[PDB]
Design an enzyme around this catalytic site. Structure first.
Site, PDB file in Angstrom:
ATOM      1  N   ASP A  18       2.492  -8.305  67.705  1.00 29.78           N
ATOM      2  CA  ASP A  18       3.750  -9.274  68.157  1.00 29.78           C
ATOM      3  C   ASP A  18       5.130  -8.634  68.023  1.00 29.78           C
ATOM      4  OD1 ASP A  18       3.366  -8.646  65.291  1.00 29.78           O
ATOM      5  OD2 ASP A  18       4.568 -10.471  64.458  1.00 29.78           O
TER       6      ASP A  18
HETATM    7  P1  LIG Z   1       7.934 -11.877  67.353  1.00 29.12           P
HETATM    8  O1  LIG Z   1       8.142 -11.867  68.864  1.00 29.12           O
HETATM    9  O2  LIG Z   1       6.720 -12.063  67.289  1.00 29.12           O
HETATM   10  O3  LIG Z   1       8.948 -12.954  66.829  1.00 29.12           O
HETATM   11  C1  LIG Z   1       9.523 -13.131  65.691  1.00 29.12           C
HETATM   12  C2  LIG Z   1      10.465 -13.941  65.318  1.00 29.12           C
HETATM   13  C3  LIG Z   1      11.358 -13.426  64.159  1.00 29.12           C
HETATM   14  C4  LIG Z   1      11.454 -13.689  66.552  1.00 29.12           C
HETATM   15  C5  LIG Z   1      10.476 -15.334  65.564  1.00 29.12           C
HETATM   16  O4  LIG Z   1       9.650 -15.558  66.714  1.00 29.12           O
HETATM   17  C6  LIG Z   1      11.219 -16.374  65.153  1.00 29.12           C
HETATM   18  O5  LIG Z   1      12.425 -16.362  65.863  1.00 29.12           O
HETATM   19  N1  LIG Z   1      10.995 -17.044  64.161  1.00 29.12           N
HETATM   20  C7  LIG Z   1      12.027 -18.078  63.907  1.00 29.12           C
HETATM   21  C8  LIG Z   1      13.180 -17.478  63.345  1.00 29.12           C
HETATM   22  C9  LIG Z   1      13.335 -16.825  62.165  1.00 29.12           C
HETATM   23  O6  LIG Z   1      12.657 -16.396  61.700  1.00 29.12           O
HETATM   24  N2  LIG Z   1      14.704 -16.764  61.399  1.00 29.12           N
HETATM   25  C10 LIG Z   1      14.778 -16.066  60.233  1.00 29.12           C
HETATM   26  C11 LIG Z   1      14.538 -14.577  60.275  1.00 29.12           C
HETATM   27  S1  LIG Z   1      15.916 -13.536  59.963  1.00 29.12           S
HETATM   28  C12 LIG Z   1      15.467 -13.334  58.191  1.00 29.12           C
HETATM   29  O7  LIG Z   1      14.829 -14.045  57.508  1.00 29.12           O
HETATM   30  C13 LIG Z   1      15.940 -12.104  57.717  1.00 29.12           C
HETATM   31  C14 LIG Z   1      15.998 -12.287  56.077  1.00 29.12           C
HETATM   32  C15 LIG Z   1      15.334 -10.960  55.417  1.00 29.12           C
HETATM   33  C16 LIG Z   1      15.990  -9.708  55.765  1.00 29.12           C
HETATM   34  C17 LIG Z   1      17.367  -9.643  55.343  1.00 29.12           C
HETATM   35  C18 LIG Z   1      18.104  -8.189  55.619  1.00 29.12           C
HETATM   36  C19 LIG Z   1      18.867  -7.515  54.508  1.00 29.12           C
HETATM   37  C20 LIG Z   1      18.553  -6.429  54.000  1.00 29.12           C
HETATM   38  C21 LIG Z   1      19.496  -5.244  54.275  1.00 29.12           C
HETATM   39  C22 LIG Z   1      18.902  -4.035  53.864  1.00 29.12           C
HETATM   40  C23 LIG Z   1      19.873  -3.015  54.281  1.00 29.12           C
HETATM   41  C24 LIG Z   1      19.939  -1.775  53.420  1.00 29.12           C
HETATM   42  C25 LIG Z   1      18.811  -1.628  52.446  1.00 29.12           C
END
Ligand SMILES: *P(=O)(O)OCC(C)(C)[C@H](O)C(=O)NCCC(=O)NCCSC(=O)CCCCCCCCCCCCC
Ligand SMILES: CCCCCCCCCCCCCCCCCC(=O)OC[C@H](COP(=O)([O-])OCC(O)COP(=O)([O-])OC[C@@H](COC(=O)CCCCCCCCCCCCCCCCC)OC(=O)CCCCCCCCCCCCCCCCC)OC(=O)CCCCCCCCCCCCCCCCC
Ligand SMILES: CCCCCCCCCCCCCCCCCC(=O)OC[C@H](COP(=O)([O-])OCC(O)COP(=O)([O-])OC[C@@H](COC(=O)CCCCCCCCCCCCCCCCC)OC(=O)CCCCCCCCCCCCCCCCC)OC(=O)CCCCCCCCCCCCCCCCC
Ligand SMILES: CCCCCCCCCCCCCCCCCC(=O)OC[C@H](COP(=O)([O-])OCC(O)COP(=O)([O-])OC[C@@H](COC(=O)CCCCCCCCCCCCCCCCC)OC(=O)CCCCCCCCCCCCCCCCC)OC(=O)CCCCCCCCCCCCCCCCC
Ligand SMILES: CCCCCCCCCCCCCCCCCC(=O)OC[C@H](COP(=O)([O-])OCC[N+](C)(C)C)OC(=O)CCCCCCCCCCCCCCCCC
Ligand SMILES: CCCCCCCC/C=C\CCCCCCCC(=O)OC[C@H](COP(=O)(O)OCCN)OC(=O)CCCCCCC/C=C\CCCCCCCC
Ligand SMILES: CCCCCCCC/C=C\CCCCCCCC(=O)O[C@H](COC(=O)CCCCCCC/C=C/CCCCCCCC)COP(=O)(O)OCCN
Ligand SMILES: CCCCCCCCCCCCCCCCCC(=O)OC[C@H](COP(=O)(O)OCCN)OC(=O)CCCCCCCCCCCCCCCCC
Lengths: 104, 80, 87, 128, 178, 125, 459, 110, 67, 102, 55
Positions: C42
């Site tokens: 994926d």
């Molecule tokens: P791939 O093509 O298989 O598809 C995966 C995705 C994610 C594109 C899905 O198809 C999708 O769009 N799903 C629904 C949307 C979604 O998942 N939204 C939420 C995702 S963002 C998220 O949850 C991030 C939160 C955790 C990470 C936060 C980052 C912070 C940390 C920063 C640290 C930097 C210094 C350490």
């Protein structure tokens, strides 16, 4: 231009400009060799406050240390011949006030 | 010429901090797929390295022996 | 100073990294193995593969181009084109 | 949860923290498509001229010409003596002159008074 | 840099770019490989936990909160590859890149010092000059009446043709010109 | 660095001495017979040796001897250890004399404070 | 001085009778010969000037300027060769005639012994310059530039003529020797104030002074290369020479009237350097740098101390040479790309190495790198100003910092960076251009080796 | 003089490390160099010992005397304290360089 | 000398560089030990530091409080 | 995203052209055609570069720089007690008898 | 020796599988005290702005 995208295929890669697009009025100021407005990890106000606090604290502590100096429990250094009167440029014609050092 | 890549099947995470990481991730319910690609760094001549104190005393063993020999020779020359 | 890269060396190194990946079966892996169509990965796995290639070859692939490299052959072609490898 | 980032003039807001980057309307997509179309048209024109084999010279840039003309030869015709312009011009063109005149006059008057009173150390000053 | 940009970045592209940035900054924080692997596995666990979400509004809100968290927790001095923009070796060899139009201003003695190269150069110049009309015709045939809507160029449809606007892309200076 | 700084800054600065103003009491105050310090090297000898003005203290003769030793045995720079030690010991004696002066000033000041407090007590009752 | 004057009046018929393809060769060769002949004027005395006759005399201030003019003529001829390839024979001969007449008028102006003849020739220099600008300029603004230049100069100089005739009627003679020996103090009254204003304002408009200087960018930007070379190097020094000559009869009133002009000149140094920091045109940058240097010379002349006149003369000579070299380099870059925009062409160090070296040397001389005569003059002026007052040091320091800033800024912008991709007509530098730059730069270093020749009569 | 000596040597060692690792100037990517580069490691260790004031190296005959003279002087107490803290931080960043560059496991490309 | 690059393996070292590095580290430590044996005063001091509290009022010229 | 067929085909053609261009950028074995036109090294370097400047500078100093007053000024040598002034055959006497300090 | 020991301890703490966000002191020290940012953006911007807007 520092804020502009580096991975795009610009017509002027050093200036990060495209042919024909409108040019900012202050391009001469905003080139990558000059003033940068790119985002910073820390807010501008926080950076300014921290820098000002650091420099002001250092100046205040330097003044405090100047009015509270550090030294050693010793007397003044003693030099012969009226504290080297002639060696420091005293007038040979005039007679200096005698400076006498005793043993202890 | 024509440097040959070593066999890829020799890279194991056993006996490596990577196996501890894998144990922690298994306890949490997860897995680490890039274990071996980093496990190349923990084997071979890279397996063991000195500590900071051992690095500073890199040549103390020979230096102390040379110092002892020099002191003995100096004392012998002073006596005779 | 450093020895120049070749197409065969680039292909060998990228296949080495892919075979070291634990989510890819080495026996069914080839240079034309699509990561998602016939390898069952994926987007996050593809991003991790691209990052592994970046770490392997010591240079960064922009996200605009990294999102399109879905084959080991495509990765080899991209690396060779960027590094000016013609043999 | 986390401290917020406060943008400034020289510390502008990042594109990932812009609130408008997450509230997208269908009109915004149309505007973005129009911008991309304009950029593509300009790029196509530039690339045609740039890859023309018979071209030998400089591809004149109308944007560069407009910028240079506006910054130099277009200022005075579009100037109106508003109170803001009048005050700013008077200040920035007169205030420094009188400031420096006062400073130098005070310094020279002090020096001349000291010389007249004969209490200024002028020994070894034989190069003026 | 080789791909024409789109009008906008989709939600998948936004979350993938955020994931890559977070992994790179986490690697910058976690210097050692085992620690980096552990925390990268945790980060991908978070992403996979939020992976399945039918509500696009909630997904966008999660993305916004994640971006705020990343900006707060980013490394002040993140690792940058030497040749990447901002790297210590970025644009180092731009002063050694000289073009072929400079190359054709040479003196006849200099050109005679390299006889075999300039024959092939003349062949390339003839090949360029014999294709420009076909390239411009193909470009003007395939454009919409309004004009180009993207910066993507068509390939060569016919066998004897060449992809339009190829000269500078093909003859760009080498990455280590000297 | 030392406890004297703490005593002066967080205690009775009147009882603690002032380095920039001492000595305050007469040199003969409390000394029935005090001997003036003797200088061995003359002004002309120091001038000829071209000692720096900070080096023309009462320990200048040992410095002159050290310089003469070093110049004579030039290639063997590991020679004038005895002269170096003699100069260092003379400087050490000068420093301990300075310390004695400081301590004398300190306890004379505290004795003056005790005497004036006793006088105040007598005047009060 | 006839041994130098007559060969120019022979350059005229030689130019008009030479063949169509030999005009440049003949003019250059004989201009170089005349410069070599004029080199003999550097053998000045220590007490009094060289009084050849009742009409012409040479001094330690006049001699370096005459040598500079006679040396500058052939360089202008070379630049004219550069930019006048397709002109007709008669028009080329007319251009050479204008240059020759301008040189002759400048020589007679510098060697004139009376103030009225000096004024006549110093105003006669206007006609050839105006004709050159408004006839062989390249852009539309040349007519406006000529009008501004002519009317600024005349509005400055007419009260000077009135003051000169009044002074002759009052005293008896305008001969410089007589007005120096028979000089009397000037009382502090309104009439004396206005006479001082007439003379000084004339020479300050010519100088130019800050606030009276717009004609300088207007004329220098729109003039051809030879016109820009003669405008910046020699024609700007007429005001300085006049002030160093006319201030003999203006004391002690100069001690009281110098404040407004001193403040204007110092704040003008600051303002023009700041303007140089943000200029989109290279010729405008060079013109404003010239304005700043001339303001420094004004400060030196107004403070009027023996250490300030030597610095003034050295700075005038050095600035003339440096500005001529900078204008030549900018003209080469313009003729390559047909545009004066500075950020249009970049990577010129990659494309043209030797021109990059010339740019580096010219920019180093502009920012007064020691031990160049630029720095010698600037340092003498700074020391005299420090003796005058102790905040002039602050003003000079900030001016020097900004000068270095904009010099290196223009160097980095033009020469360093990535070359413009679509500019593919950058041919290799010509031997003519390289020789022009070398002939500009070598005399600067030779005068650095021997600096006592350009320190004026107070050395 | 002493600083010229050992600082030039330290810069040369850093340049050798950078050149060997393909223009890499990050200690977060350097590692294993204690055994990877023997002579460079020895030279950098000696230079860091001289920089911090090893009791009988080049930096001992200057830094130790400087600290002793600062201690026994009529100076600013804050300046003296800052000098001592600066010496401690000098030792600290020498330790940082050595630890992140030579000790541990490799972090450079394969 | 020619050194073949290694992939995912410890680099090829040389006896000359190994012995030179060991020799110079040993030389540094020998020099430190030899100098400390002869010049231990430069690190541990040479002359005792007097104790002002042990000085007598008679030798410091301090009279009894009654005077 | 991914590669569309048009993008893939154009990339393939551009790669072919670029690789052919680089192969042409290679050089021939004959390609550089030049026009037809150590104790000894250290000895010839030491005579000129060292011996000629020292001769010139010594000649310039001994006969031109020192021909004018105060051009070369030397700090006078340090005179210690118990010494012999060589110019006048003088004897600078010793100091006093040092009181022993132990 | 105190600096040696403290630096070695803080460097050894980096091997632990614990991750924490940076402190204000760390951000101040790593960003060079914020001096290059403020003093290279504010005075330069103001000077280059007054050079064009006013002069
Ligand atoms: P791939 O093509 O298989 O598809 C995966 C995705 C994610 C594109 C899905 O198809 C999708 O769009 N799903 C629904 C949307 C979604 O998942 N939204 C939420 C995702 S963002 C998220 O949850 C991030 C939160 C955790 C990470 C936060 C980052 C912070 C940390 C920063 C640290 C930097 C210094 C350490
Ligand atoms: C207007 C504001 C103003 O006065 O600004 C002064 C300020 C100078 O600072 P300053 O030293 O404080 O002023 C003089 C002192 O106050 C007092 O100085 P002082 O006491 O030493 O006496 C000197 C004073 C003696 O006083 C007089 O002579 C008074 C009578 C003046 C008669 C009219 C003169 C006409 C010609 C002037 C030039 C025209 C061009 O001299 C003058 O007044 C000379 C005036 C002309 C100066 C030169 C102007 C050149 C052009 C400037 C840019 C123009 C755009 O700016 C100007 O003079 C230029 C203003 C331009 C508008
Ligand atoms: C005189 C030299 C005038 C400039 C060079 C003109 C010729 C030229 O293009 O040379 C490059 C070129 C190098 O060959 P290339 O590799 O083919 O050229 C490619 C690049 O152009 C090669 O260019 P590049 O970038 O590799 O280097 C060219 C070089 C060329 O640039 C320069 O030479 C610039 C020099 C002036 C800098 C700006 C003025 C500052 C004031 C200095 C005043 C000193 C006057 C001393 C007396 C001079 C008498 C002539 O520029 C530099 O080295 C950079 C600037 C270095 C500045 C050094 C520090 C200057 C301030 C301190 C000086 C202190 C001196 C007195 C000390 C007193 C106490 C002991 O030279 C030659 O080919 C020479 C052959 C012909 C020479 C003339 C005939 C000789 C026989 C008779
Ligand atoms: C406006 C203020 C103006 C102040 C002016 C005066 C400045 C004085 C400076 C004093 C020394 C500062 C030391 C460094 C501070 C920064 C540390 C840092 O960034 O480390 C990261 C850096 C490693 O970073 P990394 O590996 O990239 O990873 C970073 C982590 O991911 C993430 O890193 P992290 O952030 O988790 O680690 C930092 C953490 C751990 O680091 C430390 O603890 C460093 C200090 C160690 C202890 C020092 C004192 C204990 C030893 C002496 C005790 C007294 C002895 C008395 C007698 C002496 C004579 C016998 O420290 C803190 O959290 C707070 C430290 C506060 C230090 C005090 C000065 C700043 C106060 C600012 C106010 C706010 C404070 C709270 C924080 C901000 C708000 C949340 O650490 C090092 O490289 C080593 C740092 C420690 C070196 C210590 C060397 C010796 C220091 C002097 C000892 C005494 C010598 C003799 C003096 C004279 C006696 C007579
Ligand atoms: C007398 C004969 C002796 C035996 C034969 C020696 C070799 C043959 C040549 C004659 C040499 C005569 C002695 C010279 C000094 C020898 C070394 C010595 O004594 O060292 C003592 C000292 C060492 O003594 P020390 O202080 O270490 O001794 C300590 C002794 N203990 C431990 C027992 C207490 O070393 C020096 O002085 C260093 C000298 C450095 C020289 C650097 C090179 C100079 C190069 C010059 C080039 C230019 C030459 C031309 C110049 C003119 C222009 C053209
Ligand atoms: C500018 C605006 C102001 C100037 C307007 C010019 C109109 C004349 C006004 C001033 C006239 C001064 C005057 O006539 O007297 C000066 C005096 C008269 O005294 P007497 O009567 O002969 O004897 C003493 C009697 N007890 O005569 C002289 O000193 C000779 C010189 C006077 C010439 C007039 C001065 C002109 C003013 C010079 C300003 C120059 C401005 C330059 C413009 C630059 C534009 C870019
Ligand atoms: C008490 C401490 C003072 C510290 C000073 C700090 C700097 C502040 C002073 C300069 C700031 C600018 C003030 C002058 C500029 C005029 C402001 C202006 O432009 O206002 C106009 C309208 O004009 C006015 O409002 C005038 C109000 C201020 C007038 C001040 C008194 C006038 C002074 C007369 C003297 C002028 C000559 C001065 C120099 C003479 C020689 C010394 C319209 O403003 P906008 O930009 O359109 O709207 C923005 C709203 N925030
Ligand atoms: C962390 C810092 C903690 C301590 C902060 C103290 C702040 C106040 C302070 O320093 O007071 C000391 C005081 C300053 O007074 P001062 O300005 O010297 O007055 C003389 C008049 N010209 O000092 C005095 O009034 C007397 C100082 C005596 C010592 C002088 C030594 C020289």
């Amino acid at each position: 231009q520092q804020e502009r995208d580096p991975w795009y295929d610009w017509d002027h890669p050093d200036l990060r400009l495209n042919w024909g697009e409108p040019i900012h009025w202050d391009l001469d100021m905003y080139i990558r060799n000059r003033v940068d407005t790119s985002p910073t990890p820390v807010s501008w106000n926080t950076m300014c406050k921290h820098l000002f606090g650091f420099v002001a604290f250092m100046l205040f502590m330097f003044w405090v240390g100047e009015i509270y100096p550090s030294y050693q429990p010793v007397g003044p250094k003693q030099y012969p011949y009226n504290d080297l009167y002639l060696e420091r440029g005293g007038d040979p014609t005039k007679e200096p006030e005698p400076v006498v050092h005793y043993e202890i | 010429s024509k440097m040959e890549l070593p066999d890829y099947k020799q890279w194991k995470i056993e006996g490596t901090p990577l196996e501890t990481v894998q144990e922690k991730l298994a306890a949490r319910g997860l897995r680490d797929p890039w274990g071996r690609n980093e496990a190349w760094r923990y084997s071979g001549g890279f397996a063991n390295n000195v500590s900071f104190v051992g690095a500073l005393l890199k040549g103390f063993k020979w230096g102390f022996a040379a110092f002892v020999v020099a002191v003995g020779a100096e004392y012998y020359l002073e006596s005779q | 100073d450093a020895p120049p890269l070749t197409l065969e060396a680039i292909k060998d190194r990228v296949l080495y990294v892919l075979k070291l990946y634990d989510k890819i079966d080495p026996e069914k892996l080839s240079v034309n193995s699509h990561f998602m169509k016939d390898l069952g990965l994926d987007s996050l796995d593809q991003v991790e593969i691209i990052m592994a290639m970046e770490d392997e070859f010591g240079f960064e692939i922009p996200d605009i181009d990294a999102e399109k490299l879905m084959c080991p052959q495509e990765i080899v072609d991209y690396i060779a084109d960027k590094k000016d490898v013609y043999e | 949860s986390f401290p917020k980032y406060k943008p400034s003039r020289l510390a502008t807001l990042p594109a990932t923290l812009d609130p408008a980057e997450y509230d997208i309307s269908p009109e915004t997509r149309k505007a973005q498509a129009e911008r991309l179309a304009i950029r593509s048209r300009l790029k196509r024109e530039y690339l045609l001229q740039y890859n023309d084999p018979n071209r030998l010279g400089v591809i004149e840039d109308p944007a560069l010409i407009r910028w240079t003309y506006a910054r130099s030869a277009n200022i005075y015709p579009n100037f109106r003596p508003t109170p803001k312009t009048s005050l700013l011009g008077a200040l920035f063109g007169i205030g420094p002159l009188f400031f420096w005149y006062y400073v130098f006059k005070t310094d020279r008057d002090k020096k001349e008074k000291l010389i007249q009173e004969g209490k200024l150390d002028q020994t070894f000053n034989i190069s003026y | 840099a080789f791909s024409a940009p789109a009008a906008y970045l989709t939600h998948q592209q936004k979350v993938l770019r955020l994931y890559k940035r977070a992994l790179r900054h986490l690697e910058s924080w976690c210097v050692h490989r085992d620690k980096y692997r552990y925390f990268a596995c945790l980060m991908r666990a978070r992403f996979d936990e939020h992976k399945n979400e039918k509500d696009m509004v909630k997904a966008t809100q999660l993305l916004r909160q994640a971006e705020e968290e990343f900006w707060y927790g980013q490394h002040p001095q993140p690792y940058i590859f030497p040749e990447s923009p901002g790297g210590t070796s970025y644009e180092r060899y731009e002063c050694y890149k000289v073009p072929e139009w400079c190359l054709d201003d040479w003196h006849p003695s200099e050109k005679a010092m390299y006889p075999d190269y300039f024959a092939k150069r003349e062949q390339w110049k003839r090949l360029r000059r014999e294709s420009w009309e076909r390239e411009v015709k193909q470009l003007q045939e395939e454009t919409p009446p309004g004009g180009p809507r993207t910066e993507a160029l068509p390939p060569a449809r016919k066998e004897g043709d060449l992809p339009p606007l190829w000269w500078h892309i093909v003859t760009r200076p080498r990455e280590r010109p000297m | 660095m030392g406890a004297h700084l703490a005593r002066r800054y967080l205690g009775d600065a009147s009882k603690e001495p002032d380095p920039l103003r001492m000595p305050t009491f007469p040199p003969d105050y409390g000394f029935p017979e005090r001997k003036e310090r003797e200088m061995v090297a003359t002004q002309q000898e120091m001038n000829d040796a071209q000692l720096m003005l900070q080096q023309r203290d009462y320990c200048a003769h040992y410095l002159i001897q050290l310089l003469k030793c070093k110049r004579d045995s030039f290639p063997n720079f590991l020679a004038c250890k005895h002269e170096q030690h003699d100069w260092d010991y003379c400087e050490h004696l000068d420093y301990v004399k300075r310390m004695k002066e400081f301590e004398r000033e300190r306890r004379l000041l505290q004795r003056k404070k005790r005497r004036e407090q006793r006088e105040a007590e007598m005047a009060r009752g | 001085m006839l041994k130098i004057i007559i060969p120019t009046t022979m350059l005229l018929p030689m130019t008009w009778m030479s063949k169509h393809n030999m005009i440049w060769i003949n003019a250059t060769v004989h201009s170089l010969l005349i410069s070599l002949i004029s080199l003999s004027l550097l053998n000045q005395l220590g007490e009094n000037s060289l009084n050849f006759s009742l009409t012409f005399f040479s001094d330690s201030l006049s001699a370096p300027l005459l040598v500079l003019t006679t040396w500058l003529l052939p360089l202008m001829l070379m630049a004219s060769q550069s930019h006048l390839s397709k002109e007709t024979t008669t028009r080329k001969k007319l251009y050479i005639t204008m240059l020759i007449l301008l040189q002759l008028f400048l020589i007679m102006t510098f060697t004139a012994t009376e103030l009225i003849l000096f004024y006549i020739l110093f105003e006669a220099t206007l006609v050839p310059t105006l004709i050159i600008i408004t006839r062989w300029g390249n852009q539309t603004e040349r007519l406006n530039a000529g009008l501004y230049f002519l009317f600024y100069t005349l509005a400055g100089s007419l009260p000077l003529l009135v003051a000169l005739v009044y002074i002759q009627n009052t005293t008896g003679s305008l001969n410089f020797l007589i007005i120096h020996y028979w000089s009397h103090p000037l009382s502090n009254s309104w009439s004396n104030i206005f006479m001082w204003l007439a003379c000084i304002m004339a020479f300050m408009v010519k100088m130019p002074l800050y606030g009276l200087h717009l004609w300088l960018p207007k004329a220098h930007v729109e003039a051809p290369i030879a016109g820009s070379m003669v405008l910046a190097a020699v024609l700007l020094k007429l005001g300085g020479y006049g002030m160093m000559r006319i201030t003999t009869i203006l004391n002690p009133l100069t001690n009281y009237m110098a404040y407004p002009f001193l403040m204007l000149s110092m704040w003008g140094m600051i303002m023009t350097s700041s303007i140089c920091l943000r200029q989109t045109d290279l010729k405008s940058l060079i013109a404003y740098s010239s304005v700043s240097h001339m303001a420094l010379v004004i400060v030196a002349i107004m403070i009027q101390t023996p250490w300030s006149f030597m610095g003034a003369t050295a700075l005038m000579i050095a600035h003339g040479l440096t500005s001529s070299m900078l204008f030549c380099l900018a003209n080469t870059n313009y003729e390559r790309v047909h545009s004066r925009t500075m950020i249009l062409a970049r990577g010129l160090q990659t494309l043209l190495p030797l021109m990059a070296t010339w740019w580096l040397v010219a920019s180093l001389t502009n920012l007064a790198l020691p031990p160049s005569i630029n720095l010698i003059g600037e340092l003498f002026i700074i020391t005299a100003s420090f003796s005058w007052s102790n905040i002039t040091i602050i003003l000079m320091g900030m001016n020097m910092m900004i000068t270095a800033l904009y010099s290196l800024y223009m160097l980095i912008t033009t020469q360093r960076g990535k070359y413009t991709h679509h500019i593919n007509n950058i041919k290799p530098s010509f031997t003519r251009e390289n020789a022009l730059m070398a002939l500009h730069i070598l005399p600067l270093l030779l005068l650095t080796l021997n600096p006592k020749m350009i320190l004026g009569p107070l050395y | 003089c002493m600083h010229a000596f050992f600082k030039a040597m330290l810069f040369m060692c850093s340049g050798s490390i950078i050149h060997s690792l393909n223009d890499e100037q990050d200690i977060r990517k350097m590692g294993g160099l204690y055994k990877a580069m023997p002579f460079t490691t020895t030279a950098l260790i000696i230079g860091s010992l001289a920089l911090t004031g090893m009791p009988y190296l080049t930096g001992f005959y200057s830094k130790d005397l400087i600290i002793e003279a600062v201690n026994m002087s009529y100076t600013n107490a804050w300046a003296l304290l800052m000098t001592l803290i600066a010496t401690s931080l000098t030792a600290a960043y020498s330790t940082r360089i050595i630890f992140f560059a030579f000790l541990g496991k490799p972090r450079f490309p394969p | 000398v020619h050194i073949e690059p290694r992939y995912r393996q410890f680099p090829q070292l040389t006896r000359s560089q190994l012995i030179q590095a060991e020799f110079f580290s040993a030389t540094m430590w020998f020099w430190i030990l030899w100098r400390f044996w002869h010049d231990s005063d430069a690190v541990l001091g040479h002359f005792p530091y007097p104790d002002p509290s042990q000085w007598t009022d008679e030798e410091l010229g301090i009279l009894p409080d009654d005077e | 995203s991914g590669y569309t067929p048009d993008e893939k085909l154009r990339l393939q053609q551009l790669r072919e052209l670029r690789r052919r261009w680089l192969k042409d950028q290679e050089l021939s074995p004959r390609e550089p055609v030049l026009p037809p036109r150590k104790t000894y090294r250290h000895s010839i370097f030491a005579v000129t570069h060292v011996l000629i400047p020292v001769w010139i500078i010594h000649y310039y100093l001994k006969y031109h720089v020192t021909a004018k007053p105060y051009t070369v000024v030397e700090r006078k040598p340090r005179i210690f007690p118990g010494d012999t002034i060589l110019e006048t055959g003088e004897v600078i006497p010793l100091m006093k008898e040092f009181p022993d300090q132990h | 020796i105190m600096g040696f020991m403290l630096a070695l301890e803080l460097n050894n703490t980096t091997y632990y599988l614990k991750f924490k966000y940076p402190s204000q002191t760390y951000k101040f020290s790593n960003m060079l005290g914020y001096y290059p940012s403020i003093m290279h953006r504010l005075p330069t911007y103001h000077n280059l702005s007054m050079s064009q807007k006013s002069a």
